[PDB]
Design a protein around this ligand. Structure first.
Ligand code: HEM
Length: 462
């Protein structure tokens, strides 16, 4: 009926709105704007397109209705698809392989499946601890070692391959190719129309990198299809399992795509979560005290945890829940309007228009979070968790297109933190000033800490 124009900031005489896209992490510019605009959504003019940002909890509830808005590859995930293919992260819902992979892989990513992966997560976590034992007093490169942790973990659980990233500084070539390709993929989302001589060659090396990755994974696949067909890992499951709906197995191409997808979607989200958590614990040390108490309660001496240990945790899970409220590592994923829509009874969203969920602004909206800028893990007890706004906490996405890796991620992080705090006294020698970098994910950059073995008399409990 009587529509309202989506609010829009006044615009700059030289830059228009493009200055909001500048810097190491433009989602933070969007967050400051959101704090100026109480209507809960705003509009920017980016060269040709319209950019819309949404953070009001009720509006986001509307944008979360998969009858009205859905994730679409349409254009925003097109470059990342260069290496994701029609894997789960980079395929449209209507493509048959999405449904197939989804229904095949969900049981493999459920909570009751996590025990099957524990020994693998633990193998990698112990290697991290080993490195930190070996280098006490020297600078720990937190982001870097967390990326090692998560790459090795997802690689071992995904396709039983051990990159041994803590034995050496230099990463395995497969992972260097992954890193290069990921960086270049984000570069393609911008840059100018006419390509200079350096850029053409960079595209050639990019497609070459991708080929080298496809080759390694393909080789593992063929070469598992001869003898065998399943050694517990996710690949072994994708080799046998059929879709209970169509009766079909996944193609070999699509299996490789899923393996690539696990790596794309799993390492910098999870390593980001872990780095941000160590940052937050350094900045809220009473919380860190409570976590040390939990660790000493459950793992006295040099006791090695089981999956049961992880599931008996309380403080550390709630720490992670609140860290994801402050610093959710995919912070600006978007939905697309299926039809012309009207949200808030006021605001028109045309068919095909993207609306980004401004996760930091949503995760901190005063209408949904009391004292939103306060780090408080008691928000996440069973009792208080029940009273949250149902659309104001979306760190693992939404609906059918939600994170399938959530339980893997949270298990991995719980365990890493448990072992780290079991062994190490954390220390901040440089007064780390938080510097956030945005690519596919957000992440603390140039974050160094120091660790020292906890001595026996320094543990709690008797
Ligand atoms: C080993 C760890 C993980 C794996 C294997 C994984 C895997 C995936 C996959 C396959 C998807 C696409 C699901 C679909 O469309 O069917 C997905 C989506 C998503 N994941 Fe994860 N993930 C992991 C960790 C994380 C973490 C730690 C976060 C956030 C803190 C996260 C946030 C998300 C979000 C927001 C989406 C939706 C993305 C969108 O709407 O475009 N993931 N993940």
């Amino acid at each position: 009926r009587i529509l309202a124009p989506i609010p829009s900031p006044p615009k700059h005489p030289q830059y228009g709105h493009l200055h909001y896209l500048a810097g190491d992490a433009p989602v933070l510019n969007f967050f400051q704007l959101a704090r100026q605009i109480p209507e809960g959504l705003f509009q920017l003019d980016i060269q040709g397109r319209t950019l819309i940002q949404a953070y009001d909890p009720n509006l986001v509830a509307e944008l979360t209705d998969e009858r009205r808005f859905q994730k679409r590859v349409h254009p925003a995930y097109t470059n990342i698809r260069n290496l994701g293919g029609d894997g789960l992260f980079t395929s449209d819902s209507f493509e048959p392989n999405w449904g197939k992979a989804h229904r095949i892989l969900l049981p493999a990513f459920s909570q009751r499946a996590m025990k099957g992966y524990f020994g693998q997560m633990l193998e990698v976590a112990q290697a991290l601890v080993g490195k930190w034992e070996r280098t006490q007093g020297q600078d720990v490169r937190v982001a870097d070692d967390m990326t090692r942790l998560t790459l090795d973990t997802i690689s071992l659980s995904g396709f039983d391959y051990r990159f041994r990233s803590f034995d050496k500084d230099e990463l395995h070539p497969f992972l260097q190719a992954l890193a290069r390709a990921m960086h270049h993929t984000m570069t393609m989302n911008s840059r100018p129309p006419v390509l200079t001589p350096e850029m053409e060659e960079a595209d050639r090396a990019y497609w070459a990198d991708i080929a080298s990755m496809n080759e390694l994974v393909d080789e593992v696949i063929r070469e598992r299809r001869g003898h065998g067909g399943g050694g517990g890992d996710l690949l072994g499951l994708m080799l046998n399992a059929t879709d209970p709906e169509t009766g079909e197995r996944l193609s070999d191409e699509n299996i490789r795509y899923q393996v690539m997808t696990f790596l794309i979607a799993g390492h910098e989200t999870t390593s980001g979560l872990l780095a941000f958590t160590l940052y937050l614990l350094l900045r809220h040390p009473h919380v860190l005290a409570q976590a040390y108490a939990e660790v000493d309660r459950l793992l006295p001496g040099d006791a090695v945890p089981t999956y049961d240990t992880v599931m008996r945790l309380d403080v550390i899970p709630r720490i992670l829940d609140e860290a994801l409220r402050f610093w959710s590592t995919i912070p600006n994923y978007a939905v697309t309007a299926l039809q012309d829509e009207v949200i808030g009874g006021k605001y028109e969203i045309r068919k095909g228009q993207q609306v980004a969920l401004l996760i930091p602004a949503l995760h901190r909206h005063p209408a949904a979070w009391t004292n939103p800028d306060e780090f408080d893990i008691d928000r996440w007890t069973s009792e208080n968790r029940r009273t949250h706004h149902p659309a104001a906490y979306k760190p693992f996405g939404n609906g059918m297109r939600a994170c399938i890796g959530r339980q893997f991620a949270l298990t991995e992080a719980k365990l890493a933190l448990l072992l780290i705090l079991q062994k190490f006294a954390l220390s901040d020698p440089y007064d780390y000033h938080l510097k956030v970098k945005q690519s596919l994910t957000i992440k603390p950059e140039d974050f160094a800490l120091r660790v020292r073995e906890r001595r026996p008399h320094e543990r709690f409990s008797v």
